[PDB]
Design an enzyme around this catalytic site. Structure first.
Site, PDB file in Angstrom:
ATOM      1  N   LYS A 289      57.594  75.188  45.114  1.00  0.00           N
ATOM      2  CA  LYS A 289      58.598  74.818  46.108  1.00  0.00           C
ATOM      3  C   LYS A 289      58.960  76.046  46.940  1.00  0.00           C
ATOM      4  O   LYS A 289      59.151  75.956  48.152  1.00  0.00           O
ATOM      5  CB  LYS A 289      59.863  74.288  45.427  1.00  0.00           C
ATOM      6  CG  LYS A 289      59.634  73.125  44.479  1.00  0.00           C
ATOM      7  CD  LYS A 289      60.945  72.669  43.865  1.00  0.00           C
ATOM      8  CE  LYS A 289      60.730  71.575  42.829  1.00  0.00           C
ATOM      9  NZ  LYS A 289      60.090  72.099  41.597  1.00  0.00           N
TER      10      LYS A 289
ATOM     11  N   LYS B 205      60.555  67.749  46.102  1.00  0.00           N
ATOM     12  CA  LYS B 205      59.791  68.264  44.973  1.00  0.00           C
ATOM     13  C   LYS B 205      58.479  68.882  45.438  1.00  0.00           C
ATOM     14  O   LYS B 205      57.822  69.603  44.686  1.00  0.00           O
ATOM     15  CB  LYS B 205      59.514  67.142  43.971  1.00  0.00           C
ATOM     16  CG  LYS B 205      60.765  66.557  43.346  1.00  0.00           C
ATOM     17  CD  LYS B 205      61.531  67.610  42.559  1.00  0.00           C
ATOM     18  CE  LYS B 205      62.782  67.019  41.930  1.00  0.00           C
ATOM     19  NZ  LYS B 205      63.478  68.005  41.066  1.00  0.00           N
TER      20      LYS B 205
ATOM     21  N   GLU C  70      68.441  76.223  40.799  1.00  0.00           N
ATOM     22  CA  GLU C  70      69.182  77.086  39.888  1.00  0.00           C
ATOM     23  C   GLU C  70      68.159  77.579  38.865  1.00  0.00           C
ATOM     24  O   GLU C  70      68.391  78.544  38.132  1.00  0.00           O
ATOM     25  CB  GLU C  70      70.296  76.307  39.180  1.00  0.00           C
ATOM     26  CG  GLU C  70      71.692  76.549  39.749  1.00  0.00           C
ATOM     27  CD  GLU C  70      72.767  75.783  38.999  1.00  0.00           C
ATOM     28  OE1 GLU C  70      72.481  75.265  37.898  1.00  0.00           O
ATOM     29  OE2 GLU C  70      73.907  75.709  39.508  1.00  0.00           O
TER      30      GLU C  70
HETATM   31  C1  LIG Z   1      73.058  73.899  42.137  1.00  0.00           C
HETATM   32  C2  LIG Z   1      71.867  72.962  41.985  1.00  0.00           C
HETATM   33  C3  LIG Z   1      70.738  73.436  41.342  1.00  0.00           C
HETATM   34  C4  LIG Z   1      69.540  72.652  41.185  1.00  0.00           C
HETATM   35  N1  LIG Z   1      68.341  73.084  40.668  1.00  0.00           N
HETATM   36  C5  LIG Z   1      67.143  72.515  40.653  1.00  0.00           C
HETATM   37  C6  LIG Z   1      65.860  73.205  40.269  1.00  0.00           C
HETATM   38  O1  LIG Z   1      65.895  74.327  39.783  1.00  0.00           O
HETATM   39  N2  LIG Z   1      64.681  72.507  40.456  1.00  0.00           N
HETATM   40  C7  LIG Z   1      64.603  71.189  40.971  1.00  0.00           C
HETATM   41  O2  LIG Z   1      63.499  70.648  41.117  1.00  0.00           O
HETATM   42  N3  LIG Z   1      65.819  70.590  41.298  1.00  0.00           N
HETATM   43  C8  LIG Z   1      67.029  71.165  41.173  1.00  0.00           C
HETATM   44  N4  LIG Z   1      68.240  70.581  41.533  1.00  0.00           N
HETATM   45  C9  LIG Z   1      68.121  69.158  42.048  1.00  0.00           C
HETATM   46  C10 LIG Z   1      68.922  68.165  41.160  1.00  0.00           C
HETATM   47  O3  LIG Z   1      68.141  67.707  40.095  1.00  0.00           O
HETATM   48  C11 LIG Z   1      69.401  67.070  42.199  1.00  0.00           C
HETATM   49  O4  LIG Z   1      70.307  67.599  43.218  1.00  0.00           O
HETATM   50  C12 LIG Z   1      70.038  65.812  41.594  1.00  0.00           C
HETATM   51  O5  LIG Z   1      69.173  65.237  40.592  1.00  0.00           O
HETATM   52  C13 LIG Z   1      70.489  64.689  42.524  1.00  0.00           C
HETATM   53  O6  LIG Z   1      69.386  64.236  43.280  1.00  0.00           O
HETATM   54  P1  LIG Z   1      69.355  64.503  44.884  1.00  0.00           P
HETATM   55  O7  LIG Z   1      69.465  65.908  45.259  1.00  0.00           O
HETATM   56  O8  LIG Z   1      67.963  63.902  45.243  1.00  0.00           O
HETATM   57  O9  LIG Z   1      70.403  63.723  45.557  1.00  0.00           O
HETATM   58  C14 LIG Z   1      69.514  71.292  41.705  1.00  0.00           C
HETATM   59  C15 LIG Z   1      70.725  70.844  42.354  1.00  0.00           C
HETATM   60  C16 LIG Z   1      71.871  71.630  42.526  1.00  0.00           C
HETATM   61  C17 LIG Z   1      72.940  70.937  43.320  1.00  0.00           C
END
Ligand SMILES: Cc1cc2nc3c(=O)[nH]c(=O)nc-3n(C[C@H](O)[C@H](O)[C@H](O)COP(=O)(O)O)c2cc1C
Ligand SMILES: Cc1cc2nc3c(=O)[nH]c(=O)nc-3n(C[C@H](O)[C@H](O)[C@H](O)COP(=O)(O)O)c2cc1C
Lengths: 216, 216
Positions: free
Chosen positions: A73, A13, A164
């Site tokens: 980020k 983050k 995303e």
């Molecule tokens: C395709 C995709 C898009 C995502 N987009 C965002 C985003 O725009 N901003 C953000 O802070 N996290 C984003 N995430 C993080 C998700 O919230 C996160 O992967 C999920 O909560 C599981 O936690 P972890 O990655 O710590 O294991 C995204 C994850 C994926 C896989």
């Protein structure tokens, strides 16, 4: 242990704007992008890797309005990868794929290459001609690449966060992807998390195996 | 080294039907499926992990006709994973995710939970209502999971092969997935390759970085 990595990697983050990837690491993340598998080895993708402040600023243009909470980020990370998918599967690309495979020595005869080309074209047509979903088919291969990438960078001891939450229309325009036959799908800033990255210490949360898995 | 893994893993064309995953390895591949990241941690998926002879045979039914060249991969592998995506994103599922994160202690304050719920709702709705493409959005998350999985099993020293060469209609019907709210997308046999796996020794082929990567 890759399982420990999966239980430890997390969506960064906050990045330390002073910690940059080493030259070797930069080469390695590009290798990860390149060697990801894909249906028929179609490799229907392109990647923008911004490492300069100007480059990151251009990508950050997509973190506008609703997505402004993702701007930092994109600006603080060391390298920001924009995952793009082809907008249409053209024969030209299919030809490049099979010719590269021949160059790498994957065919023992010309017939073998022709067969490989015929087969790839056959399945490409299934999407292009019949289903009319080659765009979604290729986007799927890119997400698979993203999945491969996130675990790979985590295994490198590096931090990253898949995004995303960005305006792809803006990003496409900024890099003239439309005219190049590509469209942006996921932005992945890579680097080292800062001390303020609270998500580095929060426990990982997933639904239980009893819900998501069926053994047979 | 994870890069050596990426450069060495390959799509297995023939498995040694006598080599099974150990109890520990079987638990680990499930951990990999479960802990893959996904947009908003939506985990819009379900996995069928077939290890019994009949279980694999039922999955193999989908490799009929044109796809018969994938039948033996499904039959000989130790564990065959069917990656499925939910067919629609329901509110209950969204609530489950946030409630699970709360249960897992990811929210220090009620405001933290609210922010997470708000964010997920906003984007889930963007796909469920604004774009009416939540089916494609969830499918993309499943492919990301597949990418994570292939690299993961590779790092465990296990062989596998991702498969799109199957009839999802047949597979869905075979496991009554539709009624359960799921649809099959990718089949991944996992095990150990036999010396007859011609692809185990063929050079890996990918287009050059100069073509697929743009540095900024
Ligand atoms: C395709 C995709 C898009 C995502 N987009 C965002 C985003 O725009 N901003 C953000 O802070 N996290 C984003 N995430 C993080 C998700 O919230 C996160 O992967 C999920 O909560 C599981 O936690 P972890 O990655 O710590 O294991 C995204 C994850 C994926 C896989
Ligand atoms: C989504 C997806 C579907 C695939 N389907 C098949 C299949 O049906 N049968 C098969 O033998 N290989 C299949 N492949 C393997 C590709 O041909 C392979 O990933 C590619 O040629 C690159 O080789 P590698 O996996 O050895 O690195 C698939 C790959 C992906 C990523």
């Amino acid at each position: 242990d890759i399982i420990s990595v999966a239980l430890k990697r997390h969506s960064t983050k906050a990045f330390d704007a002073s910690k940059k990837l080493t030259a070797e690491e930069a080469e390695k993340i590009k290798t990860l992008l390149q060697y990801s598998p894909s249906s028929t080895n179609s490799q229907p993708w392109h990647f923008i890797v911004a490492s300069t402040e100007e480059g990151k600023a251009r990508v950050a243009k997509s973190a506008a309005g609703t997505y402004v909470f993702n701007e930092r980020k994109m600006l603080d990370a060391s390298h920001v990868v924009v995952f793009c998918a082809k907008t249409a599967m053209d024969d030209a690309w299919l030809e490049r794929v099979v010719d590269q495979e021949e160059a790498d020595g994957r065919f023992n005869t010309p017939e073998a290459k022709a067969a490989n080309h015929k087969g790839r074209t056959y399945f490409a047509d299934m999407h292009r001609v019949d289903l009319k979903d080659d765009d979604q088919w290729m986007a799927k291969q890119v997400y698979l690449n993203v999945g491969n990438f996130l675990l790979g960078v985590g295994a490198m001891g590096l931090d990253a966060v898949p995004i995303e939450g960005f305006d792809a229309a803006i990003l496409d325009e900024e890099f003239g992807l439309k005219e190049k036959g590509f469209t942006s799908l996921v932005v992945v800033p890579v680097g080292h998390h800062s001390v303020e990255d609270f998500n580095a210490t929060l426990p990982k949360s997933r639904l239980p195996l009893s819900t998501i898995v069926t053994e047979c």
